[PDB]
Design a protein around this ligand. Structure first.
Ligand SMILES: [Br-]
Ligand SMILES: [Br-]
Ligand SMILES: [Br-]
Ligand SMILES: [Br-]
Ligand SMILES: [Br-]
Ligand code: NA
Length: 129
């Protein structure tokens, strides 16, 4: 599924992401835009052999199992394929663990480089929330 901007905002809000660990909704929508272009089916392989999955590009080295990342953990206790569903519940729950592990949303490189310190509220402007 490719989400619309306001559609994703509303889905994230319903799943408790608005102001989760102090990050306003616009941060999460901005990160999803530049990580996956709002596409739940996005995948990207990294040079170390791990793969990033889904709307928030969650990495297989630490967070999910994809059966092909040898030295890896599965901290969200899910198959990586569950992160590609049109239902974002799995991605959101896992993201909540990630953002809580100490480094905040800096775990998402695109957020750091393209959202951090910008007017992120712009990403939910005009939306019915
Ligand atoms: Br957009
Ligand atoms: Br915001
Ligand atoms: Br594995
Ligand atoms: Br959903
Ligand atoms: Br933080
Ligand atoms: Na893994």
């Amino acid at each position: 599924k490719v989400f619309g901007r306001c559609e994703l905002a509303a889905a994230m809000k319903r799943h408790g992401l608005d102001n989760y660990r102090g990050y306003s909704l616009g941060n999460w929508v901005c990160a999803a835009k530049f990580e996956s272009n709002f596409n739940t089916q996005a995948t990207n392989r990294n040079t170390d052999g791990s793969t990033d999955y889904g709307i928030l590009q969650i990495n297989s080295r630490w967070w999910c199992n994809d059966g092909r990342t040898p030295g890896s953990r599965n901290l969200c206790n899910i198959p990586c394929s569950a992160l590609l569903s049109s239902d974002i519940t799995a991605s959101v729950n896992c993201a909540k663990k990630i953002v809580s592990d100490g480094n905040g949303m800096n775990a998402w490189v695109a957020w750091r480089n393209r959202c951090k310190g910008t007017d992120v509220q712009a990403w939910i402007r005009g939306c019915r929330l």
